[PDB]
Symmetry: C3
């Protein structure tokens, strides 16, 4: 049948000690709640109903919005969404702070819901302390008892409520209408709806997650960090099984997506962010950070190199200690060495910038040698200007190129030159500065 989702995002995240709404805190670079939304979309949800208390502005700025003005609990929260439920759709209840719930588990949950009844996700814990206990009579679920209100006998129950469940909209709206708030907490308890479904003589079927981490909620940053490590380990293991050699999968982080070829080797402490594409036989040395980059076949990134919005073609070498900024592009066989920064600049085929250089806003040809210490002066304090270097140019060490300026093919620039005017094809330019020599200084 058809289905929509309600994501509860309206708890108080006091133990996060944060000014950022709890469900916005990221896991693997993505807000927790977005993990949950992604899963919902994968399930084929027709609507996603997001219930919130505060941070509504930032929530909408970041990500069907449903206000819960007073933090009066989950039952009350659902009461707020209930009018938006279709009588003819299934409604899946999820939490914005339970980010690792898997599509497989949810699919099995939807499959297990008995006609007219409820599908309830439960899990058996070694220590169920503090959790809602699943109450069964002769094997069938009839009730949930919260820890606080549970008796000593009930507290021996190990099967507990994850709070994730599915029911038909018409049925759900009915059960929510029958909730009672007259009690020691002054709130409606969502958990009472399973007893209410039972009262109507309807069935509550259960399924279990595959992993405990799937139904773990985040209330503080220690708990978020554990889930971060679980998720990173999962990603790392998939990459290994898919043929990427991670030299230490416990020291690898992916925060986005990695599209990869064959026989790649990634060394320790590499961080991949955004969407990165790696060709065949790429090697990434220790400590590198890549964000939104494309790296061509057989390229080698040496240790402690940082790249963002950069492109390497095949057979390129970069680093160690290089810094590629957005718009940095290396054509086939180009080389960028240590203590070199490239920004919005292209280095043509086989061209080399091996040391202690800044190349910004530059179009550099093929077969070019950029000597150590070369710098493009691309900024006048108001605007930025382009440097153009042709093919087969030799730029001597510690030269400044003062943009806008063009150096034609075949030219040679002497060490220590300040280039302010265009250089013609096959021209040598060199500073003829006079020195004083003083004997016996």
């Amino acid at each position: 049948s058809s289905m929509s989702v309600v994501i509860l995002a309206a708890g108080k995240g006091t133990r996060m000690y944060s000014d950022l709404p709890k469900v916005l805190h990221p896991l693997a670079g993505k807000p927790m709640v977005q993990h949950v939304i992604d899963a919902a979309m994968k399930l084929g949800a027709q609507h996603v109903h997001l219930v919130y208390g505060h941070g509504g502005e930032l929530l909408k700025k970041t990500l069907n919005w449903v206000l819960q003005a007073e933090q009066l609990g989950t039952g009350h929260a659902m009461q707020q969404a209930a009018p938006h439920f279709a009588d003819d759709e299934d409604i899946l209840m999820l939490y914005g702070d339970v980010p690792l719930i898997s599509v497989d588990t949810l699919q099995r949950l939807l499959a297990a819901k008995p006609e007219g009844g409820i599908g309830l996700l439960t899990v058996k814990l070694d220590n169920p302390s503090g959790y809602g206990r699943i109450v069964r009579e002769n094997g069938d679920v009839v009730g949930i008892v919260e820890h606080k209100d549970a008796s000593d006998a009930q507290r021996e129950i190990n099967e507990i409520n994850t709070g994730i469940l599915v029911a038909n909209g018409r049925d759900l709206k009915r059960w929510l209408s029958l909730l009672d708030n007259n009690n020691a907490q002054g709130e409606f308890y969502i958990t009472d709806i399973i007893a209410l479904a039972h009262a109507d003589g309807k069935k509550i079927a259960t399924v279990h997650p595959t992993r405990l981490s799937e139904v773990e909620g985040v209330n503080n940053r220690l708990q978020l960090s554990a889930l971060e490590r679980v998720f990173q380990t999962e990603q790392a293991e998939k990459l290994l099984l898919a043929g990427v050699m991670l030299l230490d999968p416990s020291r690898f982080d992916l925060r986005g997506e990695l599209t990869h070829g064959r026989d790649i080797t990634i060394d320790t402490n590499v961080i991949i962010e955004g969407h990165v594409i790696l060709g065949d036989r790429v090697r990434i040395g220790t400590g590198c950070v890549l964000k939104n980059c494309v790296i061509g076949d057989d390229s080698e990134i040496s240790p402690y190199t940082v790249l963002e919005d950069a492109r390497l073609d095949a057979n390129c070498t970069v680093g160690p200690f290089a810094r590629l900024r957005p718009g940095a592009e290396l054509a086939e066989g180009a080389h960028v060495g240590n203590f070199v920064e490239i920004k919005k600049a292209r280095l043509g085929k086989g061209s080399k910038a091996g040391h202690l250089s800044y190349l910004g806003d530059a179009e550099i040809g093929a077969g070019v040698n950029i000597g150590a210490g070369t710098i493009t002066c691309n900024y006048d304090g108001a605007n930025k200007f382009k440097t153009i270097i042709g093919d087969d140019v030799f730029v001597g060490s510690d030269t400044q190129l003062v943009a806008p300026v063009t150096v034609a093919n075949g030219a040679t620039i002497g060490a220590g030159t300040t280039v302010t005017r265009d250089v013609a094809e096959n021209e040598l330019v060199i500073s003829r500065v006079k020195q004083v020599h003083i004997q016996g200084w």
Copy 2:
């Protein structure tokens, strides 16, 4: 009552293979024995009696000193300290190589000591092999039997001696006087004092540590490394619960103290040393090392940045690959980029040094742009001299400023300039060097 501590620091650390006395080997940046002293001071010890064998010079240089001339054992060691005990104080016995003993455990130990008797810290191990066994008769402690001298029946005992205990000074001095040395080892066994206390009809009460790591001793560097990881994990978890987001708490080290604000994010492989203070919303990228630094609100430290004795005001950005040395100071909104080293220099509000620069012994104003490749020549081979740069100065790329020299407000320095004489307000200075152009080179 009143209390003093005896710390035993006189064992042979042969399996450390070190020229540094064993108890001086650090854990989280602090000698093991100093952890123990700190705990003692927290307990309110009136005196700390440190018993040593060798390395006394270095020990005192590093940290009431009590010689044990001949390594004749713990009983003998205590005999050496006994004359310093007051008849009217409690004496707590600790070890310099058991660094994680907690104040809580010790407080409970002091509370459990029966009048006229002994408080003894014991622990139950899955494998008690090699440890002193606690001998009980009808539930009461009467004895300790060392493993070697224990029978097969005794060796089944899992409750073992940690060697940590407390007794009144007068009582202790008596029991120590009654120790016998005529045996297969020629030494007095400290453990005999519990049997001696029993002989006098006094009670020996026991308490247990909360964690096994609290009473683990260090005899080799493998054991020290395990304790280092335990301690770092504890620190990391406290920081997470306190609201600091560590993106991987297994790749975080604190060796000193971290004072922090709210909504801080620290990425993998960060090392914090000395005392570091972080404002709200500070972000620290992967690989950074901070030692004795103050970082203001909303500052961002990019990957692979090293800072020591440095100060950032609010909204500053530094790195990646920047190196801030002692006396480096950034005013609000300042920026230091890649391959820049700052030493005993201040960069004023909104001023920028983005690349490949060395700024030492310099006072730099607000609104200054330091071009790539700029270097302060602060050294003449004997002394060091200051560079002063006013507000709203534009320093062109690859300039050297030869100190002492002053550049006034509003000035502009052309690329490639060697500045040796003061520059006046709103002055442009630029090198007019002649070049040779040779066609067809």
Copy 3:
């Protein structure tokens, strides 16, 4: 008796997803199969028979070669090697993808082989699923039953076949000749030889490895990564017990050999490759990579320093963010600072290159100060040339030395100089460039 080894290297490594033969994939910097060969040589093998299917070219290029033209299984594989066995030697069967098998285990295996019979290495697993089961009758091994062909009763057996075994050559050749291929797989099963040995009334003795990891095979990169971590942890623990202080042994990698002195400290995330030699009291900061280097007593390598084929004498300091390339050599007390690259260059006693410099193909004397920004121009686009700097030379900041060129003892080079001609003893050389000053720019 005398002994030879057969290493099976002819499986299909489909789940590696690699163009490199599976047994060539490295563990700790060394092909898996080379670990196995090393063990064989340590055992005193007279011959090593390597059976292969494909990748024979690359295998021989990388490492008695024995073709198995058709991947028809292990029995068939051994049939191919059998003619090379001496009737009067023991033959040990190993696998190229089981890299951590220990010499101790193998020695015990060889010792346990009964005259005329077989020594078989087996292991007891918590989950034996998918493994060959060891079949015993009244305690004696008579059979091996592969999982697939095993009954439900047989599958309860926890003792499984590692496939590692030893038998006399004459005996082995006989048993291999009697293998039957007429079955649902069309292959000879090596495991049948133990039933065949039993048929002849010979004994099959068993021994067990000390660690499970010793007999773990690699079929995919996830499995290789687990073995990599096991191996690195073993190496790290040995180094700690031997007296090297690793500040985090889970963040330490050795890919080769480390020869070390006393009281060394290595911080987190250090990678040692090739053969590295460290003197006493060397400290290595976080993030460093050392490959084929010799570091003298009391030297300190600061964070994020990369060295290859480099030599430091005693009391040297390098980094942070320094890059030493092959042929880099520092004499006693020399210093290389941040953003400095040294290649095929020697820095003499007490000489300093603290910042933003490139020194290549250079002989630099003692007592030299290399100012920030100094660069050797060692390349003309075709060849490379040497720079020679004498003792007690002061090179001013941002100087280029244009090789070949010699600077004699005692000389001083002014900031910003382009040195193209030899400098005489005690000479000051300095650029006298004229500037334009424009007021009110």
